[PDB]
Design a protein around this ligand. Structure first.
Ligand code: SF4
Ligand code: SF4
Length: 278
């Protein structure tokens, strides 16, 4: 499963000491994604100011804002010659602007140096603050993603810093700004199949274009227990359900990480968007 483009990329990463989520989180898709020249980057440090029971990011006091991070990310993207880059980060309630500047500047830096690279920006909610969100939207990523992750009943318990309505509102906000929007559902957290169906419906109504539906992998014993393993035939049904609701791009199964096939999904959302308005 090891190809020449994966090989070139790992060489470049090693020699330059570039940090990627792909290597550092031990993602099993790396062979496939790097062959398509797609990679994922973490900004804002690895200590989040919030706590979600499914999430592998540690909660802690974040280090000082590193304003050189955007340049650093854009340079890694350039060095790797990526066709698609995902930028993700933690919540930054310690910062007065929630880290809005950092997210936007990273996108702007990437696009200034990599005009042919599609950029996907996965954001926290910024408290749903219109002016923070507007700052981020203006950066103009190819995809604005904000993952609701689970259904309302479970959401209110294991994402105490968020609300289901505010998050859906982030997606609606991004859709009005003209962005292609994306969200993720994590199955195996205790949700019912019916709750999954209404959540997909909610996301579609919120204006979401791309949805990924994946299996919960419990990070450690301190984290939320796995409530089930979804069968393949069940992922297929959910995927067909989402396609039938009119999502432009749908991916379901053991995806391990939310950025799996991000480039292909964007392409489908862009192709269908062009098709519609032609
Ligand atoms: S999901 Fe986001 S806000 Fe919640 S712990 Fe993980 S990084 Fe922090
Ligand atoms: S799925 Fe995401 S984290 Fe994993 S290799 Fe692909 S781009 Fe990197």
């Amino acid at each position: 499963r090891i190809g020449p483009e994966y090989t070139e990329l790992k060489n470049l990463v090693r020699r330059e000491g570039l940090h990627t989520v792909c290597e550092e989180a031990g993602c099993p898709n790396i062979f496939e994604c790097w062959e398509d020249r797609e990679a994922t980057f973490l900004i804002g440090g690895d200590q989040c100011t919030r706590r979600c029971d499914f999430c592998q990011i540690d909660t802690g006091k974040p280090a000082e804002l590193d304003r050189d991070e955007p340049r650093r990310v854009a340079d890694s993207v350039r060095t790797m010659g990526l066709r698609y880059a995902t930028v993700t980060g933690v919540a930054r309630d310690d910062l007065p602007d929630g880290g809005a500047w950092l997210y936007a500047a990273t996108v702007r830096a990437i696009k200034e140096l990599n005009p042919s690279t599609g950029v996907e920006l996965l954001i926290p909610d910024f408290n749903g603050e219109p002016t923070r969100l507007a700052e981020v939207f203006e950066s103009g990523p190819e995809v604005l993603a904000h993952n609701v992750e689970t259904v309302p009943r479970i959401f209110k318990r294991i994402r105490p810093a968020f609300t289901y309505r505010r998050s859906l509102g982030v997606l609606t906000a991004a859709r009005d700004a003209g962005l292609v929007t994306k969200s993720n559902l994590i199955l195996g957290l205790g949700e019912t199949s019916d709750e999954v169906r209404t959540a997909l419906g909610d996301l579609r109504d919120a204006g979401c274009d791309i949805v990924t539906i994946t299996q919960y992998l419990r990070p450690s014993a301190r984290h939320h227990p796995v409530e089930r393993w979804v069968k393949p035939e069940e992922f297929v049904q959910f995927a067909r359900f989402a396609e039938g609701l009119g999502f432009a791009g749908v991916l379901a199964g053991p995806l391990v990480r939310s950025s799996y096939r991000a480039g292909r999904l964007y392409e489908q959302a862009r192709n269908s968007r062009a098709l519609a308005s032609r």
